[PDB]
Amino acid sequence: NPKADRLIQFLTEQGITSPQVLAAIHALPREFFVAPSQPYIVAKMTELLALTPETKVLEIGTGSGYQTAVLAKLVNHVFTVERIKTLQWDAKRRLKQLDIYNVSTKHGDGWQGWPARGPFDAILVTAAAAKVPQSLLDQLAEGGRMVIPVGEDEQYLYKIVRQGGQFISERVEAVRFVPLVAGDLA
Numbered sequence: 688n689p690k691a692d693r694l695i696q697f698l699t700e701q702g703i704t705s706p707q708v709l710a711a712i713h714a715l716p717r718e719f720f721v722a723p724s725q726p727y728i729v730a731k732m733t734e735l736l737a738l739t740p741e742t743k744v745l746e747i748g749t750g751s752g753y754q755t756a757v758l759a760k761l762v763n764h765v766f767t768v769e770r771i772k773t774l775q776w777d778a779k780r781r782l783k784q785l786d787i788y789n790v791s792t793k794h795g796d797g798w799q800g801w802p803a804r805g806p807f808d809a810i811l812v813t814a815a816a817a818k819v820p821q822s823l824l825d826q827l828a829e830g831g832r833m834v835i836p837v838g839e840d841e842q843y844l845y846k847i848v849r850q851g852g853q854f855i856s857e858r859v860e861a862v863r864f865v866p867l868v869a870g871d872l873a
């Protein structure tokens with residue numbers, strides 16, 4: 688079908704050719720995640736997490752659940768956090784309608800991560816933070832990868848890995864997300 692193919696064609700032209708990520712993406716009706724921007728950003732961040740079916744993922748910023756759905760097709764289980772209640776409800780509902788049942792959602796504050804659920808192999812954060820929430824670092828399993836937009840006015844996507852007990856930071860490319868908001872919930 689055209690739209691699925693057009694989008695995948697687009698991504699490859701942008702330099703995104705991980706067959707894994709492209710298929711995950713192609714399988715998802717993007718237009719459905721507007722029930723009640725750049726699919727490139729989703730592809731790039733997804734690619735950076737270097738996912739494998741054995742990967743335990745924490746996502747911050749469930750939102751429409753689009754990027755959630757992408758993640759779920761790629762790993763055995765996803766844990767996702769959204770601070771806006773109604774958004775959590777929807778996304779939760781969309782995931783069941785697409786028979787995606789390997790996702791645990793939580794209405795809460797991503798700044799705190801989701802400690803209860805063990806260390807995570809991949810951490811994806813889809814809201815900008817001026818500095819890396821240390822809680823997330825603390826929840827990053829050994830050999831784990833974290834992808835996060837960092838900054839205020841200026842923003843850069845970062846990939847951080849925990850290997851040999853050492854955290855290593857790679858600045859990837861300029862972006863612009865809405866802020867990771869701390870404090871109470873809505």
Ligand SMILES: Nc1ncnc2c1ncn2[C@@H]1O[C@H](CSCC[C@H](N)C(=O)O)[C@@H](O)[C@H]1O
Pocket residue numbers: 747748749750751752753754755768769770771774795796797798813814865866867868869
């Ligand atoms: N502190 C926080 N903890 C968890 N989610 C937060 C947060 N601050 C903002 N958010 C949420 O992060 C989202 C950014 S939009 C994120 C896009 C989403 N991955 C999608 O595919 O649609 C917004 O829904 C916002 O409500």
Ligand SMILES: [Ca+2]
Pocket residue numbers: 702703704
């Ligand atoms: Ca590439």
